[PDB]
Amino acid sequence: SVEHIPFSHTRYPEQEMRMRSQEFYELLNKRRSVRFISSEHVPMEVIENVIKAAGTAPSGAHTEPWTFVVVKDPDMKHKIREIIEEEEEINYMKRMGKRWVTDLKKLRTNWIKEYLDTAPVLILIFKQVHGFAANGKKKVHYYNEISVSIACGLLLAALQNAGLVTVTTTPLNCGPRLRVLLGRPSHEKLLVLLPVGYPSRDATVPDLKRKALDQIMVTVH
Amino acid sequence: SVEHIPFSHTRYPEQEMRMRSQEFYELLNKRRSVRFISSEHVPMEVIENVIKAAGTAPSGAHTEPWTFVVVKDPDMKHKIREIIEEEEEINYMKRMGKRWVTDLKKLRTNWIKEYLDTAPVLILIFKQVHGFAANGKKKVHYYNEISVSIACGLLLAALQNAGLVTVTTTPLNCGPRLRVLLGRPSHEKLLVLLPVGYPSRDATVPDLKRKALDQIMVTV
Ligand SMILES: Cc1cc2nc3c(=O)[nH]c(=O)nc-3n(C[C@H](O)[C@H](O)[C@H](O)COP(=O)(O)O)c2cc1C
Ligand SMILES: Cc1cc2nc3c(=O)[nH]c(=O)nc-3n(C[C@H](O)[C@H](O)[C@H](O)COP(=O)(O)O)c2cc1C
Ligand SMILES: N[C@@H](Cc1cc(I)c(O)c(I)c1)C(=O)O
Ligand SMILES: N[C@@H](Cc1cc(I)c(O)c(I)c1)C(=O)O
Structure with missing residues (x-):
């Protein structure tokens, strides 16, 4: 059934729009995955x-x-x-394959994950690959992975805006065991782990460059 | 290859963190998918x-x-x-199946999509299922769908921050035809299509409510 209200929307004059979009870009652009998180307490709010x-x-x-x-x-x-x-x-010694571990080399990343212990909060985002109403029939969750991924893009933005750092991890093949450990029902699958907090004093990042705009945007006539 | 540098953080005194994260929540919450886009030009910058x-x-x-x-x-x-x-x-008539079609009545969409003509900008996100080294050889794109989708999330945040509207659309079976039409290369697959502009004067949305925190979050 459900009805349809007008949409009220808030506009800005063109100059303000530009400001806010440069600035928001300049803010998101400082986001870097950080793999070294202080043990220090974060506000639960x-x-x-x-x-x-x-x-x-x-x-x-x-x-x-x-x-x-x-x-x-x-x-x-x-x-x-x-x-x-x-x-x-196991993923490094064999499961990922030679090509994947090679491609990983430059980031100097290994199976050791100090942060899962040091980070004051973890966030495990689970997708629901279907659902159930109170009625108890299965419902279909269309494009669930894309949906949860977006939501997850939104998380990253909010964290960076709130002054916290993390890294987007997808621990291969740890899904089923973490589900069970965390008492999540069979229709939920892990999609990402994010350790959250303040960067450690000695925090470093790999000196990577993002692509120039003309390499992600194509205008077509 | 490599190079690893000290990471520079820009910190906030906690009170301010609660304030910024609340505002940003409120800001984002006013986003809705809007399917009636006005034809006003928007600025390129x-x-x-x-x-x-x-x-x-x-x-x-x-x-x-x-x-x-x-x-x-x-x-x-x-x-x-x-x-x-x-x-x-075709999708509505035969191909999405009955269940799906029904799941969609509440939103009052069909296959007429006026915003495709009206809106002053279309944005088509394609994911690269693989790519190409500078040296011309194939490189693997680990988790490209999740990566592209995430980016897409940030794009939705950025649209919202800037006072524009859109509707995340997945045009089922349109993938290939649009790819060729837009000249894109074989290794690119269409993820999502975003008509962008301001809402039409008349613009509606369905009256949907969002889950509350305790229906999405669980502490252990
Ligand atoms: C879905 C996807 C999977 C990722 N998986 C891992 C991973 O499991 N381990 C890790 O340290 N980083 C992971 N990352 C972080 C990326 O390596 C990082 O985003 C990329 O190197 C660019 O770094 P940046 O976030 O600082 O721009 C992942 C990122 C994406 C989007
Ligand atoms: C990945 C996914 C696919 C979507 N596909 C369509 C679609 O093909 N057509 C459409 O009108 N909306 C599509 N949407 C818009 C959603 O229906 C919309 O978010 C939902 O109905 C609730 O709307 P809200 O954005 O106002 O909160 C899609 C959204 C998601 C994230
Ligand atoms: N998940 C493993 C390996 C991994 C590292 C990176 I860096 C990456 O982008 C991806 I895809 C996978 C780990 O966390 O060490
Ligand atoms: N892409 C089709 C069908 C569709 C409508 C909605 I609303 C939706 O949430 C989903 I998944 C699919 C269309 O644009 O009408």
């Missing part, structure tokens, strides 16, 4: 306000196919760390 | 900046596997409308 932000993503036919699992318990965080090192280490 | 924003996304092994095809030419915009409308008609 903020973590909430960024998850809230993520939950404003669009989603196939309005299905909102996403769960955000927040872990700050030092002992559950450790248990996650165990599952992921065990798996990542 | 802005479309540009929302794309620069979208391009600052993370990506699997720093592959950046995204191409944003911007189309403002009315002729071309029209030929996109023909293709899509032709195909969504």
Whole structure:
């Protein structure tokens, strides 16, 4: 059924629009995945306000196919760390394949993940690959992966705006074990882990360049 | 290859963090998919900046596997409308199946898509399923769909921040036809299509409510 209201919208005059879009670009452009996170405590309000932000993503036919699992318990965080090192280490020695580990080299990345223990909160984003109403019939979540991914793009923006850092991780093959560990139901699958907090004093990043605009944008006549 | 540098953070005193993260939530919450786009011209510098924003996304092994095809030419915009409308008609009639079609009544969409002609900008996000080294050899794009989608998330944030509207659309079975029409290379696949501009004077949205925090978040 559902009815249809007018849309009220807030416009800015063209000059203001430009300002806000340069500035927002200049802000997002400082976002860098950080793999070295201070142990220092983050305000729980903020973590909430960024998850809230993520939950404003669009989603196939309005299905909102996403769960955000927040872990700050030092002992559950450790248990996650165990599952992921065990798996990542197999992924590096063999599972990923030679080509993938080669391609990874430059980032100086290994199966050791200090941050899963040091980061004050983790965020595990789970997609719901279908759902159930209160009625208990299966519902279809169209384009669930894209939807949750967008939402997730929204998370990254809110974190960077709120002055927190993270890295977007997809720990290969740790899905099923983390589901079970975290008591998530069978219709939910892990899509990303994000460790959240302040960068560590000694935090570094790989000196990578983003592509020039004329290499992501094509105008067509 | 490599090179690793000290990372420079720009920190905020906690009170300010709650304030910024609340405002940014409120800001984002006023975004809705809008399917009635006015034909007013929008400024390029802005479309540009929302794309620069979208391009600052993370990506699997720093592959950046995204191409944003911007189309403002009315002729071309029209030929996109023909293709899509032709195909969504089939989609609604025979091809999406009954369940899906029903799931969509509440939103009052069909295969007529006027914003394809009306809107002053179309943005087609394509994902690069693989790419090419400077030296011409194939390189793998790890998690390209998630990477491109994420970028797309930042693009939606950037549109919103800037006072424009759109509607994330997935034109099922339009992929190939639009690819060739827009001249794109074989290794590119259309993800999503965004008609961008201001809302029409008349513009509606369905009256949907969003989940509350405790229906999406779970602490352990
Ligand atoms: C990936 C995905 C696919 C979508 N595909 C379409 C579509 O093909 N046609 C359309 O009108 N809207 C599409 N949308 C818009 C959604 O229907 C919209 O977000 C949802 O109905 C709730 O709307 P909201 O943005 O106002 O919160 C899509 C959204 C998502 C994220
Ligand atoms: C979906 C996808 C998967 C990723 N997986 C990992 C990963 O598992 N481990 C890791 O350290 N970083 C991962 N990242 C972070 C990227 O390596 C990083 O985004 C890329 O090198 C560019 O770095 P930047 O975010 O600072 O721009 C992933 C990013 C994307 C979008
Ligand atoms: N892409 C088609 C069908 C469609 C409508 C909506 I609303 C939606 O959320 C999804 I998934 C698909 C169209 O544009 O009408
Ligand atoms: N997930 C592993 C390996 C990995 C590293 C990077 I850097 C990356 O972009 C991707 I795709 C995979 C790890 O976290 O070490």
